[PDB]
């Protein structure tokens, strides 16, 4: 029945995200969405009574990697937006991986697993952009990037965190399926138009 399957079927909402990320030469960000898409699909597949018998890894692993993979997707989608140079790129990519790994391990169901990375990624972005505004004496990301990427990207970001942390109280079938859709849009929108380090 559909009300058990929809949290698994809606986990294909990240398939637009990986197909767009690869098309834009963002091949690292493409890995993290594809990895997340697989582990989120399996995390819900093993949860759903209609199909839980299929799956081949224990629940302990899938729960950790669906949560870690999600929080790391939110991180690399934001460090793609920051668009740092070297060796700050590899450095700030690695800061996300190590911090989100340890934090997701310590308590994975604590909302802090998402809030820490988003808070730190927003601070790292705000430090770069306020330096770059002071350098140019003007609004640094063009008013197009604010009105087309950041604005809509964080608008779906606010919707995604509200659907997961608040409206889960009302439902887990449709609300959690709409959360997958909302979060896939944040990853598509917060990516730049091209990877400037590859094309």
């Amino acid at each position, epitope marked *: 029945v559909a009300k058990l399957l929809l949290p698994t079927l809606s986990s294909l909402a990240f398939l637009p995200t990986v197909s767009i990320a690869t098309k834009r030469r963002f091949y690292m960000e493409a890995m993290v969405y594809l990895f997340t898409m697989f582990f989120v699909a399996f995390s819900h597949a093993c949860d759903g009574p209609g199909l839980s018998v299929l799956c081949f890894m224990r629940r302990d692993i899938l729960e950790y990697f669906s949560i870690y993979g999600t929080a790391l997707s939110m991180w690399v989608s934001l460090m793609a937006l920051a668009d740092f140079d070297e060796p700050q790129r590899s450095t700030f990519t690695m800061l996300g991986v190590l911090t989100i790994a340890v934090r997701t391990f310590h308590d994975r169901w604590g909302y802090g697993v998402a809030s820490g990375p988003i808070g730190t990624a927003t601070l790292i972005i705000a430090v770069k952009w306020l330096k770059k505004m002071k350098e*140019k*004496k*003007g*609004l640094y990301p*063009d008013k*197009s990037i604010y009105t087309q990427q950041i604005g809509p990207g964080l608008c779906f970001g606010a919707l995604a965190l509200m659907l997961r942390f608040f409206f889960e109280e009302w439902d887990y079938t449709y609300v959690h399926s709409f959360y997958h859709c909302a979060l896939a849009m944040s990853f598509v929108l917060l990516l730049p138009k091209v990877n*400037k380090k590859a094309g």
Partner: antibody
Amino acid sequence: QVTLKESGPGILQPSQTLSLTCSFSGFSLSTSGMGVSWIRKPSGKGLEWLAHIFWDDDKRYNPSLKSRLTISKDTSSNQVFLMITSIDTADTATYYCARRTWLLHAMDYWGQGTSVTVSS
Amino acid sequence: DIQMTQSPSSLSASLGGKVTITCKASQDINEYIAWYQHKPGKGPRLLIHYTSTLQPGIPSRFSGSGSGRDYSFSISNLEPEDIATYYCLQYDNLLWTFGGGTKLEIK
């Protein structure tokens, strides 16, 4: 409306310092993030940037000419002044002032421009 | 500074035709190009900024594109009112430089 107006001597002798005035209207350079740029076009050449002055009273000059460029403002009389030293035949030009914003950094309104030439 | 180059120094084009005034920067300038129309004996107008964004009040015939040291300004169905000199402005630095400028003319 937004409007600008250049003014200057028009004609003068070589090896002399001149003051060019730009009066601004519809806005004030007192506004946070607001700036004015001075650009010149030598007779039979492409456009060439000269100088900047800003809300914070920071300044900037074209580094090849920086040795004889000096810019200043009076927001009380809604004006910017660009002074060129040691004027020569290369300064036979039309001089423009252009208002730059905080949101679009490329200058969005120009004045009509004024002619400058050196002769005896 | 950064030297800027426009490919046609002058461009003869038919009334109601199309043009593609093409521009190369000396180095990467992060899409901070703006395109100006210098109508003869008058103050220039800003048409396009950040490579592609049109200024409000501009007909949709003018359109810019390109990224990374090569940008393209284009007029569609060009009117007799479009016969003017067209300059790009590099504005990634506060050390601005203009292109040599294209004297577009009627064929």
